[PDB]
Amino acid sequence: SVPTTCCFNLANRKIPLQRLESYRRITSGKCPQKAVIFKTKLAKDICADPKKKWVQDSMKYLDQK
Amino acid sequence: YDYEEARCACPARHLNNTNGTVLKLLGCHYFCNGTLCTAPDGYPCYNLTAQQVRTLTTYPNTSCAVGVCMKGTCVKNGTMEQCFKTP
Numbered sequence: 001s002v003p004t005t006c007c008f009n010l011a012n013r014k015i016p017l018q019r020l021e022s023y024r025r026i027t028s029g030k031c032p033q034k035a036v037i038f039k040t041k042l043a044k045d046i047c048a049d050p051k052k053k054w055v056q057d058s059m060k061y062l063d064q065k
Numbered sequence: 066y067d068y069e070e071a072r073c074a075c076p077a078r079h080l081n082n083t084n085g086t087v088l089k090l091l092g093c094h095y096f097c098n099g100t101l102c103t104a105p106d107g108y109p110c111y112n113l114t115a116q117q118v119r120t121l122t123t124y125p126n127t128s129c130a131v132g133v134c135m136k137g138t139c140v141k142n143g144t145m146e147q148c149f150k151t152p
Contacts, residue, residue, distance in 0.1 A: 002088070003079075003088070003151070004078065004151045004152060005076035005078055005079070005151075006077065006079045006088055007074075007076045008077065008090070008104055008108055009073045009075075009105070009123075010074060011070075011071045012070070013070055013071065015066075015071075016066060026076075028128055029087075030087055030088055031079070031087065031088055032088065032089070032094035032108065032109055033085045035076075037076055043074055044075070045076050047074045047075065048076065064105055
């Protein structure tokens, strides 16, 4: 229930869909700010703002994958 | 794609507390892919002594000074919390 990492720098520019493997939502009010964490195919985690259209669309894409 | 613009958009391990407030960074810096990044100004942090950091684990031990990040320095604000690493 307590996130093991939090996001404090959010990627503003779109990550290409072909690089994305999965995502998780950091919604706990215990992190200083909410975020979506994308995991890439290189197994890196990238923080993004859930309020950007590209973030919501990338989540929809990964839900379909 | 601008890798340089996104170089510091990686998450970081924070410290919890038994005090019911947000998780906070240890200090004001973190690595992304082995490269140095700085937390934004105003971000919550803990300022621990050199003695304290040797025994910082996933359970509290002694009182931790709260602060805020200011140009990469965790500046204390007077509040103390019983902090510990998230697992």
